[PDB]
Amino acid sequence: VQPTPADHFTFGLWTVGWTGADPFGVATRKNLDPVEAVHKLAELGAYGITFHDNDLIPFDATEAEREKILGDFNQALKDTGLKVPMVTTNLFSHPVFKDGGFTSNDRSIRRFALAKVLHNIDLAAEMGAETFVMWGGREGSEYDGSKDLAAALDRMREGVDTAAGYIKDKGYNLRIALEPKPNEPRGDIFLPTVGHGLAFIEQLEHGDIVGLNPETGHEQMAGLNFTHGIAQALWAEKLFHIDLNGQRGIKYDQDLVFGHGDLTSAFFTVDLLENGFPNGGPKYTGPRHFDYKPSRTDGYDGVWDSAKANMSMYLLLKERALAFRADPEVQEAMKTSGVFELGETTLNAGESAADLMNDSASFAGFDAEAAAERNFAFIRLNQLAIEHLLGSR
Amino acid sequence: VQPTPADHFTFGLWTVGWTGADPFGVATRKNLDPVEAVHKLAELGAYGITFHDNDLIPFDATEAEREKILGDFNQALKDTGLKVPMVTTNLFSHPVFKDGGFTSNDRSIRRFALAKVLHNIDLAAEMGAETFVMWGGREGSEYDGSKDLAAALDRMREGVDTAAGYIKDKGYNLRIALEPKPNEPRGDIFLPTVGHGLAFIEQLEHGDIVGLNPETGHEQMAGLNFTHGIAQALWAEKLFHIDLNGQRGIKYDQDLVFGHGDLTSAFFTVDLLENGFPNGGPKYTGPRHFDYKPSRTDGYDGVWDSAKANMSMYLLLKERALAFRADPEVQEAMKTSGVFELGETTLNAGESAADLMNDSASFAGFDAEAAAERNFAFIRLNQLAIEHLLGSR
Amino acid sequence: VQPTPADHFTFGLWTVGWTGADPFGVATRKNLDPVEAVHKLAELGAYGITFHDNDLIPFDATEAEREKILGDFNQALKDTGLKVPMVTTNLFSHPVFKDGGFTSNDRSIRRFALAKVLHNIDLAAEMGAETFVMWGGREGSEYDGSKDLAAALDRMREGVDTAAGYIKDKGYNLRIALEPKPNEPRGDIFLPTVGHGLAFIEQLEHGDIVGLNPETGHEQMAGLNFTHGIAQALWAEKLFHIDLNGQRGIKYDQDLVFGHGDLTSAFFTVDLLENGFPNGGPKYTGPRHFDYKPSRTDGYDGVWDSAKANMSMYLLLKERALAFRADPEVQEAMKTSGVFELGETTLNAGESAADLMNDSASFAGFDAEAAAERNFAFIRLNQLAIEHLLGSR
Amino acid sequence: VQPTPADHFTFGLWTVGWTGADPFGVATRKNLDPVEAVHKLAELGAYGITFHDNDLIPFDATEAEREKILGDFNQALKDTGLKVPMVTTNLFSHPVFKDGGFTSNDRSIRRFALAKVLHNIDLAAEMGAETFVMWGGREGSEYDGSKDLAAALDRMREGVDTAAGYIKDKGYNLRIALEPKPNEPRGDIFLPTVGHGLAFIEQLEHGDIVGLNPETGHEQMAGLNFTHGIAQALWAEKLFHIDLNGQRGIKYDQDLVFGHGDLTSAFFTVDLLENGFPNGGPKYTGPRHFDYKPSRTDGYDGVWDSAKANMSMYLLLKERALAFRADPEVQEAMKTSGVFELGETTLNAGESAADLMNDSASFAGFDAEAAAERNFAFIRLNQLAIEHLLGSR
Ligand SMILES: OC[C@@H](O)[C@H](O)[C@@H](O)CO
Ligand SMILES: OC[C@@H](O)[C@H](O)[C@@H](O)CO
Ligand SMILES: OC[C@@H](O)[C@H](O)[C@@H](O)CO
Ligand SMILES: OC[C@@H](O)[C@H](O)[C@@H](O)CO
Ligand SMILES: [Al+3]
Ligand SMILES: [Al+3]
Ligand SMILES: [Al+3]
Ligand SMILES: [Al+3]
Ligand SMILES: [Mg+2]
Ligand SMILES: [Mg+2]
Ligand SMILES: [Mg+2]
Ligand SMILES: [Mg+2]
């Protein structure tokens, strides 16, 4: 399996650039020059690179430094051919963002945070990004009385709608993608799961350009089924981007290589990205972005190995998932279990509520105990899927 | 603390009627006559009673039996004065519902399930209920390939929209309330959290009459903040009902008495139900419904004790939550922490995106390190809240 | 991969005999006759069968019924050659055990539970079982004040030492194995994980014959690593038996087929059971016992499919794990990462604490900054295992 | 409730000295000088202070610097009278310990880690500490194939027995206390819960002087009951020290103030530390050590508030717990529920297993159906505890 730019594997600069500092220890790796990252990633088969404004341009950078850095970075882009599909803002590392950007209790700070996002939309626009991500990491609380929960959601809408309004105003071909996370760094984060982000979008003035950027590990941190979560995002036509990684349970976000967490879940995420829905439906057509961190135990060969591991993992799962649905045994098993039958509407063409209550065959004369005898054979369909995952079929 | 009908404590018949059978053991209590439950609950201060169609009327009941039971039950209602604010359908106990009602793979079963709900809307209407609850307990899967996830959501919409359409058609003064649950009985349940239920409502043809019925324990089973979840439901004006109980962690749904789980969370749920939001906003005005199960270890004195425990727990939390916000120290502490400041809009009246990026005080000349010095004092606000919870203030 | 008696695959009578009643519904399958169970299991390639006293003999059975059941049951064993390697007692389904068997607050229930176990040891010995499992499913509480926690453990010790002493006194060739479970059906069970189980055994008078019976799903309910957990039992020489199944997450116990839960974990469990430790050490030679339940959505064809699936899953993982370890590229990745270097003692033969203290090279002149550059290459080593698991190397 | 030295409240230097760097941002507070820390703590009513060798003496410090630091530090102790009851080692922050101290795959890191601990025992003894804590924070893995699991435990044993033997050899008056942690910073830590810690100690050569140092937040990260967990350590005579804090859920460790997590659990922890067991047994007489971190959102006023808050929380719970147990209504609720009857031996003085077996009244003529009607009244008993906790009885 060799990734080619046609695969669309994108990586953030913070992923391979993550230095190894965590709650209990200092960095184990030297900083990564952004030019170097770009060249390395392009030699592995990456299609593009993403960044946070401060991944690239330091918080205190003078104008001269910003031009230099950008000059250096765009040169690397021109040399390698890498695209920049997504840009995001860091509204979490500086101490001023300790209570949030957009939902900070301090108003002067809320205003700076929205100003910092607006400037970053310009930059995103200049880099040719199609997506602008919002990961509200400091938006939330440790204690329940710290916030007025209705005012926090108004404050979040004000920021997102101002951003969206500004895109429309400038004529930028950019969409906003919110990235849910249930906790960490805060005790509780606002809009914690794919359903909470989708719900919020519907309350926005400019929600037509706002969608989601679900991350595997984030949903699994609430113990939810990531595949089910991206299926709801897809079904509402709001899956604008994805952050792929692995997580091994309900605990801190591990950010492991994609497929290095819940493998069977990973397998069915790739089937959904590649195969779409069994009865037809929208398909995810964007970048397959990896948002992970190379373990701090490993030196720089480990970093390039882990970059590679991501794309290898995606490609192997993809091979198996295509083999899985192409198998006649699997198709027959899907039929038997009623996967295709789920696709047929419950009512008949022009059959109303009254029409059906009335129909004696569907209710009064319906034989509930006979119907209950159906062997759905979901275990056998599950064994078939795993056997294809293990490469034994 | 003595509950009076003015408190609006409602209980389902399945709660005190729960007999004690679980995964590993048989019932420890005799069945509860519904007439008796009604009389008992009315003597404790209950305001109303709720039920599932089969809690009352057996699945195989002949018409004569249904009239008898209903005659017996409405007589008890007339004698005690209890109201019936909510009615719900059992789409989970019979073996025919093993794969779901509305999202069953078998179409004949999907049709029976919708027929069973439609008939139950009539009954709900006849009992004078204001709310009709939908808890999709068997809608989901154990294995990821069992369902076409986009067709499961279409199938769920077909059922809910047909139900809603039928209410509108009959002129019934009833609203539908969906009740999210992340797992149990299925491995994964569709619409698993408050955000997922709210997201789905926005895709419905008749979503103006569809809202939520969040349950405490259900949200805590995903490890989410229940108070934050009902604040988002309130903020979207979709908190139509509530199921109160307690849960002690991420594990099976325990269904303990309300306040017998996460006490501090319970405390802040009551503050939100009673006090509303600190800066103003919608208020929950419905029944305070308890959906719990008396421990199987206890005999029938324990059952009435636990019914009582629920209302006692609510009333004690309520007393403390009113004392909490009335305290001048607490009001000052809320000010200092910026609880009130969160309520002020981020932008100035008629200030646009361009206007703010431009303003040098908000960005370019904003002093980020000085701003970061603010002591938000959230710990001290948290200690103040707990001290009022413990009755030491 | 076709299993054969030589594989030592054993199944409980309650696994395939599980009829589908969960907490939200009734049985979806007809009762399985135990003689049919023996015939079907033997035909599939099983080596043995295990049971709970009330899995075979009803609670209410008379001595005539008991003798009748055992004679047919023993004839079936004969006809097929299945052994009965483990026997266990039901100390959880009847309403008398609602507060527990050995740790019930009621003393008369405690003597009844212990007498029920004492008679059951006699049946275990008669059947030729080598292991007597003890799963204390109702030993625990929902509320912290329900029990005197020191007393609960004194009473647990008393039951186990009385039973252990009875084995010793009659010279039966049997060992006791405790099976930890963190929760369900109690909110908290005593001896919740493998560590608590092992710790508890060291306080026993007759600890020499008491060991553990870990269950995959049970340690995963606390989010613990099952391979780490069994490694510690193995290391202590206390892994006497095992219960294999699957669990997707921290939630109720699912009891899926082994392999249908956390697959990467299942792969390494199989590497530890089959291959042991990289540097040598203890090995688990017992039966490979499946403690799972066929999903309630499926008819009896799915029950036999599921039994089959457990054995296939085990043999497919076994194969990948043998090929994984045999791979020269893997053995070289292991040597880079220091897997074999962990096997070396830290101290030199004859070195003492003082010796090492005052060895300048190990401390005072140690280059800590040079030692930290070591690329452990744990990521690469993990990718090699998944590629072997995926049937790609 | 004002704390006083007699309360035996100790705080680590790293708790109040924690500056705010988390995984998504930098320090939000200035470094706290250790002499200031002693002065501030003593003034608040603390009895003692604990520290990690690098909390006081930098990793790079020269012998001149080390002696300079200790002389000022020892003068402050003198001036104030604070004791130093526990000393611990940092075997987790420097990049050399990225794979662990005692269980690092690299042998040279293993001798360095053990030498660092050996020198630290000498400092502990000089300071007059009675306890030497060992938190093995980097002993573990992210991937299952990274370690030989039996070797990891042999190496852990080797370090602890070498250190234990050194204490014994120099006649220091010190005990070792292991502090279990399930995850973070490793995906899986060896000896993840109290049970694994206790089990491991029984395999030690010098186990007599090795015990535990449980931490509230740490057992709650596996969803375990902290009161059950410490009860087992207490019952084993292995609770040598404790780390108190709060955690809201299975997620990263929050280290909130004690009481700001699971409050009902905190109440019963305090009842076990203060009051012991209802029927009598062992008691924990050590210091009440707070292992927490002041939230990064707050300035130094919140740091002193938080230190204060830990002590108040403990004294408020203590009070409620003394009044709870002293209550005649509670003592009568306890007697109904069988709390005192669990204290009776199941077997009669001199009864043997055979005796009970053949006692018709305890088995053969036992009315199991009559015994099951017993109302244990666990719900009512729980309501009495919450009402005492709520300051209402
Ligand atoms: O949990 C961290 C999130 O994964 C973010 O890194 C977003 O991907 C970008 O801000
Ligand atoms: O988890 C079970 C749910 O709580 C349901 O009982 C609804 O409340 C009613 O169907
Ligand atoms: O959770 C249930 C346990 O797995 C038990 O079935 C034991 O294996 C046998 O009693
Ligand atoms: O998770 C961190 C632990 O609580 C440690 O701080 C120990 O208490 C001391 O090393
Ligand atoms: Al991301
Ligand atoms: Al409910
Ligand atoms: Al088992
Ligand atoms: Al600690
Ligand atoms: Mg992340
Ligand atoms: Mg429920
Ligand atoms: Mg089990
Ligand atoms: Mg900690």
Side-chain angles (χ1 to χ4, degrees), chain C residues 199-226:
Chain C
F200 180 72
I201 299 166
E202 296 312 321
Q203 298 309 303
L204 291 190
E205 176 189 331
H206 304 304
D208 64 297
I209 66 155
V210 183
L212 273 237
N213 184 62
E215 179 155 314
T216 311
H218 297 182
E219 317 285 306
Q220 299 177 171
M221 287 168 79
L224 296 185
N225 189 298
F226 189 62

mmCIF file of all heavy atoms in Angstrom, chain C residues 199-226:
data_model
loop_
_atom_site.group_PDB
_atom_site.id
_atom_site.type_symbol
_atom_site.label_atom_id
_atom_site.label_comp_id
_atom_site.label_asym_id
_atom_site.label_seq_id
_atom_site.Cartn_x
_atom_site.Cartn_y
_atom_site.Cartn_z
ATOM 1 N N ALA C 199 -5.107 -9.885 45.792
ATOM 2 C CA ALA C 199 -4.818 -9.220 47.042
ATOM 3 C C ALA C 199 -5.609 -9.967 48.117
ATOM 4 O O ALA C 199 -4.962 -10.465 49.085
ATOM 5 C CB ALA C 199 -5.154 -7.756 47.020
ATOM 6 N N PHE C 200 -6.930 -10.079 47.863
ATOM 7 C CA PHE C 200 -7.825 -10.837 48.754
ATOM 8 C C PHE C 200 -7.323 -12.252 49.007
ATOM 9 O O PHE C 200 -7.297 -12.670 50.184
ATOM 10 C CB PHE C 200 -9.224 -11.075 48.222
ATOM 11 C CG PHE C 200 -10.190 -11.840 49.086
ATOM 12 C CD1 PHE C 200 -10.708 -11.212 50.222
ATOM 13 C CD2 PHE C 200 -10.590 -13.123 48.753
ATOM 14 C CE1 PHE C 200 -11.620 -11.899 51.039
ATOM 15 C CE2 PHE C 200 -11.545 -13.792 49.518
ATOM 16 C CZ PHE C 200 -12.020 -13.170 50.679
ATOM 17 N N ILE C 201 -6.915 -13.041 48.011
ATOM 18 C CA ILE C 201 -6.397 -14.412 48.173
ATOM 19 C C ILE C 201 -5.250 -14.479 49.118
ATOM 20 O O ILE C 201 -5.169 -15.542 49.819
ATOM 21 C CB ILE C 201 -6.018 -15.078 46.809
ATOM 22 C CG1 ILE C 201 -7.320 -15.145 45.962
ATOM 23 C CG2 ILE C 201 -5.237 -16.416 46.897
ATOM 24 C CD1 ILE C 201 -7.030 -15.460 44.492
ATOM 25 N N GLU C 202 -4.362 -13.535 49.249
ATOM 26 C CA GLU C 202 -3.229 -13.484 50.130
ATOM 27 C C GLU C 202 -3.565 -13.340 51.578
ATOM 28 O O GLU C 202 -2.718 -13.480 52.477
ATOM 29 C CB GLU C 202 -2.286 -12.370 49.610
ATOM 30 C CG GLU C 202 -1.632 -12.541 48.239
ATOM 31 C CD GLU C 202 -0.965 -13.849 47.925
ATOM 32 O OE1 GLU C 202 -0.355 -14.320 48.904
ATOM 33 O OE2 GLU C 202 -0.926 -14.513 46.892
ATOM 34 N N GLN C 203 -4.748 -13.092 52.029
ATOM 35 C CA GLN C 203 -5.321 -12.934 53.327
ATOM 36 C C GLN C 203 -6.072 -14.196 53.744
ATOM 37 O O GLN C 203 -6.628 -14.282 54.842
ATOM 38 C CB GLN C 203 -6.264 -11.721 53.365
ATOM 39 C CG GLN C 203 -5.647 -10.406 53.082
ATOM 40 C CD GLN C 203 -4.404 -10.040 53.851
ATOM 41 O OE1 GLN C 203 -4.389 -10.021 55.066
ATOM 42 N NE2 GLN C 203 -3.298 -9.686 53.192
ATOM 43 N N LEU C 204 -6.118 -15.184 52.909
ATOM 44 C CA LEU C 204 -6.792 -16.451 53.097
ATOM 45 C C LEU C 204 -5.868 -17.406 53.835
ATOM 46 O O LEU C 204 -4.653 -17.380 53.646
ATOM 47 C CB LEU C 204 -7.205 -17.001 51.742
ATOM 48 C CG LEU C 204 -8.243 -16.425 50.872
ATOM 49 C CD1 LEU C 204 -8.515 -17.383 49.743
ATOM 50 C CD2 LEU C 204 -9.527 -16.246 51.700
ATOM 51 N N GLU C 205 -6.521 -18.255 54.601
ATOM 52 C CA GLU C 205 -5.809 -19.311 55.399
ATOM 53 C C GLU C 205 -5.363 -20.395 54.419
ATOM 54 O O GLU C 205 -4.236 -20.911 54.443
ATOM 55 C CB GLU C 205 -6.693 -19.774 56.484
ATOM 56 C CG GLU C 205 -6.549 -20.841 57.525
ATOM 57 C CD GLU C 205 -7.878 -21.042 58.280
ATOM 58 O OE1 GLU C 205 -8.734 -20.151 58.455
ATOM 59 O OE2 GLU C 205 -8.001 -22.236 58.676
ATOM 60 N N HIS C 206 -6.252 -20.742 53.480
ATOM 61 C CA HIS C 206 -6.090 -21.728 52.447
ATOM 62 C C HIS C 206 -5.886 -21.145 51.074
ATOM 63 O O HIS C 206 -6.321 -21.724 50.073
ATOM 64 C CB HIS C 206 -7.336 -22.690 52.368
ATOM 65 C CG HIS C 206 -7.530 -23.292 53.726
ATOM 66 N ND1 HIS C 206 -6.532 -23.980 54.368
ATOM 67 C CD2 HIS C 206 -8.587 -23.230 54.564
ATOM 68 C CE1 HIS C 206 -7.009 -24.340 55.532
ATOM 69 N NE2 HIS C 206 -8.235 -23.915 55.688
ATOM 70 N N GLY C 207 -5.134 -20.090 50.920
ATOM 71 C CA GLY C 207 -4.786 -19.394 49.697
ATOM 72 C C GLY C 207 -4.103 -20.159 48.614
ATOM 73 O O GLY C 207 -4.223 -19.927 47.387
ATOM 74 N N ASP C 208 -3.382 -21.226 48.946
ATOM 75 C CA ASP C 208 -2.603 -22.184 48.201
ATOM 76 C C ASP C 208 -3.433 -22.862 47.122
ATOM 77 O O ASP C 208 -2.879 -23.147 46.052
ATOM 78 C CB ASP C 208 -1.862 -23.189 49.083
ATOM 79 C CG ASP C 208 -2.692 -24.134 49.923
ATOM 80 O OD1 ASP C 208 -3.405 -23.572 50.780
ATOM 81 O OD2 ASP C 208 -2.722 -25.381 49.819
ATOM 82 N N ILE C 209 -4.689 -23.129 47.435
ATOM 83 C CA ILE C 209 -5.630 -23.705 46.487
ATOM 84 C C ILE C 209 -6.598 -22.667 45.913
ATOM 85 O O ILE C 209 -7.539 -23.122 45.225
ATOM 86 C CB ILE C 209 -6.344 -24.980 47.054
ATOM 87 C CG1 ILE C 209 -7.280 -24.695 48.257
ATOM 88 C CG2 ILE C 209 -5.300 -26.061 47.466
ATOM 89 C CD1 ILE C 209 -8.375 -25.805 48.337
ATOM 90 N N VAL C 210 -6.457 -21.369 46.152
ATOM 91 C CA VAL C 210 -7.371 -20.335 45.613
ATOM 92 C C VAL C 210 -6.595 -19.469 44.611
ATOM 93 O O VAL C 210 -5.432 -19.080 44.821
ATOM 94 C CB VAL C 210 -8.052 -19.500 46.697
ATOM 95 C CG1 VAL C 210 -9.041 -18.500 46.102
ATOM 96 C CG2 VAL C 210 -8.757 -20.312 47.760
ATOM 97 N N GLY C 211 -7.210 -19.269 43.465
ATOM 98 C CA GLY C 211 -6.582 -18.512 42.377
ATOM 99 C C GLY C 211 -7.634 -17.699 41.659
ATOM 100 O O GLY C 211 -8.668 -17.437 42.307
ATOM 101 N N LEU C 212 -7.408 -17.279 40.450
ATOM 102 C CA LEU C 212 -8.404 -16.457 39.760
ATOM 103 C C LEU C 212 -9.003 -17.040 38.498
ATOM 104 O O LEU C 212 -8.426 -17.954 37.856
ATOM 105 C CB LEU C 212 -7.609 -15.177 39.483
ATOM 106 C CG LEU C 212 -7.446 -14.005 40.394
ATOM 107 C CD1 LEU C 212 -7.955 -12.777 39.615
ATOM 108 C CD2 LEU C 212 -8.286 -14.012 41.644
ATOM 109 N N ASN C 213 -10.126 -16.461 38.073
ATOM 110 C CA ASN C 213 -10.894 -16.749 36.877
ATOM 111 C C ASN C 213 -11.315 -15.394 36.234
ATOM 112 O O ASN C 213 -12.473 -15.021 36.281
ATOM 113 C CB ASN C 213 -12.117 -17.639 37.121
ATOM 114 C CG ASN C 213 -12.823 -17.984 35.802
ATOM 115 O OD1 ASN C 213 -12.200 -18.617 34.964
ATOM 116 N ND2 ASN C 213 -14.048 -17.657 35.457
ATOM 117 N N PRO C 214 -10.328 -14.691 35.660
ATOM 118 C CA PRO C 214 -10.572 -13.394 35.039
ATOM 119 C C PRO C 214 -11.487 -13.491 33.823
ATOM 120 O O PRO C 214 -11.509 -14.546 33.166
ATOM 121 C CB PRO C 214 -9.190 -12.846 34.670
ATOM 122 C CG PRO C 214 -8.166 -13.758 35.306
ATOM 123 C CD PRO C 214 -8.914 -15.065 35.524
ATOM 124 N N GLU C 215 -12.229 -12.441 33.506
ATOM 125 C CA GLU C 215 -13.102 -12.421 32.379
ATOM 126 C C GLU C 215 -12.860 -11.123 31.629
ATOM 127 O O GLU C 215 -12.964 -10.024 32.205
ATOM 128 C CB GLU C 215 -14.589 -12.460 32.722
ATOM 129 C CG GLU C 215 -15.579 -12.425 31.596
ATOM 130 C CD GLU C 215 -16.919 -13.023 31.889
ATOM 131 O OE1 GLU C 215 -17.045 -14.109 32.443
ATOM 132 O OE2 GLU C 215 -17.843 -12.267 31.514
ATOM 133 N N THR C 216 -12.509 -11.225 30.348
ATOM 134 C CA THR C 216 -12.215 -10.148 29.417
ATOM 135 C C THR C 216 -13.067 -8.883 29.560
ATOM 136 O O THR C 216 -12.578 -7.766 29.739
ATOM 137 C CB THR C 216 -12.338 -10.590 27.864
ATOM 138 O OG1 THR C 216 -11.592 -11.806 27.736
ATOM 139 C CG2 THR C 216 -11.872 -9.496 26.915
ATOM 140 N N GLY C 217 -14.377 -8.990 29.448
ATOM 141 C CA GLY C 217 -15.442 -8.048 29.535
ATOM 142 C C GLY C 217 -15.476 -7.379 30.910
ATOM 143 O O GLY C 217 -15.727 -6.145 31.022
ATOM 144 N N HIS C 218 -15.229 -8.192 31.933
ATOM 145 C CA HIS C 218 -15.189 -7.685 33.304
ATOM 146 C C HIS C 218 -14.058 -6.729 33.530
ATOM 147 O O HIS C 218 -14.373 -5.610 34.014
ATOM 148 C CB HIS C 218 -15.155 -8.761 34.321
ATOM 149 C CG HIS C 218 -16.401 -9.621 34.296
ATOM 150 N ND1 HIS C 218 -16.299 -10.605 35.343
ATOM 151 C CD2 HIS C 218 -17.521 -9.802 33.625
ATOM 152 C CE1 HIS C 218 -17.384 -11.321 35.228
ATOM 153 N NE2 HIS C 218 -18.080 -10.898 34.223
ATOM 154 N N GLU C 219 -12.821 -6.961 33.195
ATOM 155 C CA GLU C 219 -11.783 -5.911 33.389
ATOM 156 C C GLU C 219 -11.975 -4.739 32.455
ATOM 157 O O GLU C 219 -11.660 -3.591 32.853
ATOM 158 C CB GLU C 219 -10.361 -6.403 33.295
ATOM 159 C CG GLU C 219 -10.183 -7.729 34.052
ATOM 160 C CD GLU C 219 -10.168 -7.514 35.559
ATOM 161 O OE1 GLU C 219 -9.370 -6.718 35.991
ATOM 162 O OE2 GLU C 219 -11.005 -8.213 36.141
ATOM 163 N N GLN C 220 -12.549 -4.903 31.275
ATOM 164 C CA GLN C 220 -12.827 -3.832 30.332
ATOM 165 C C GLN C 220 -13.928 -2.922 30.754
ATOM 166 O O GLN C 220 -13.942 -1.723 30.278
ATOM 167 C CB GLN C 220 -12.930 -4.374 28.921
ATOM 168 C CG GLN C 220 -11.652 -5.023 28.445
ATOM 169 C CD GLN C 220 -11.753 -5.627 27.056
ATOM 170 O OE1 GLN C 220 -10.727 -6.045 26.491
ATOM 171 N NE2 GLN C 220 -12.922 -5.736 26.456
ATOM 172 N N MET C 221 -14.822 -3.235 31.671
ATOM 173 C CA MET C 221 -15.884 -2.507 32.314
ATOM 174 C C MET C 221 -15.267 -1.482 33.265
ATOM 175 O O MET C 221 -15.972 -0.496 33.562
ATOM 176 C CB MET C 221 -16.895 -3.334 33.104
ATOM 177 C CG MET C 221 -17.793 -4.103 32.180
ATOM 178 S SD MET C 221 -18.756 -5.350 33.110
ATOM 179 C CE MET C 221 -20.020 -4.282 33.815
ATOM 180 N N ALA C 222 -14.030 -1.607 33.720
ATOM 181 C CA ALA C 222 -13.323 -0.633 34.525
ATOM 182 C C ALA C 222 -12.315 0.106 33.627
ATOM 183 O O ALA C 222 -11.461 0.894 34.059
ATOM 184 C CB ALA C 222 -12.572 -1.239 35.707
ATOM 185 N N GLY C 223 -12.287 -0.189 32.324
ATOM 186 C CA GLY C 223 -11.394 0.328 31.299
ATOM 187 C C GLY C 223 -9.971 -0.164 31.473
ATOM 188 O O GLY C 223 -8.994 0.492 31.073
ATOM 189 N N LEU C 224 -9.764 -1.327 32.087
ATOM 190 C CA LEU C 224 -8.426 -1.832 32.368
ATOM 191 C C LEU C 224 -7.953 -2.663 31.170
ATOM 192 O O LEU C 224 -8.803 -3.043 30.358
ATOM 193 C CB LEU C 224 -8.488 -2.533 33.701
ATOM 194 C CG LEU C 224 -8.795 -1.901 35.042
ATOM 195 C CD1 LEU C 224 -8.635 -2.913 36.213
ATOM 196 C CD2 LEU C 224 -7.894 -0.684 35.291
ATOM 197 N N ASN C 225 -6.637 -2.889 31.135
ATOM 198 C CA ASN C 225 -6.037 -3.665 30.025
ATOM 199 C C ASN C 225 -6.097 -5.134 30.436
ATOM 200 O O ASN C 225 -5.363 -5.585 31.396
ATOM 201 C CB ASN C 225 -4.608 -3.185 29.749
ATOM 202 C CG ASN C 225 -4.005 -3.786 28.498
ATOM 203 O OD1 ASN C 225 -3.833 -5.026 28.413
ATOM 204 N ND2 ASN C 225 -3.636 -2.987 27.529
ATOM 205 N N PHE C 226 -6.897 -5.911 29.728
ATOM 206 C CA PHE C 226 -7.051 -7.342 30.050
ATOM 207 C C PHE C 226 -5.781 -8.101 29.960
ATOM 208 O O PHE C 226 -5.606 -8.970 30.878
ATOM 209 C CB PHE C 226 -8.195 -7.969 29.200
ATOM 210 C CG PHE C 226 -8.551 -9.370 29.647
ATOM 211 C CD1 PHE C 226 -9.047 -9.601 30.922
ATOM 212 C CD2 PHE C 226 -8.332 -10.475 28.806
ATOM 213 C CE1 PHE C 226 -9.269 -10.920 31.338
ATOM 214 C CE2 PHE C 226 -8.651 -11.747 29.199
ATOM 215 C CZ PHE C 226 -9.155 -11.971 30.465
#
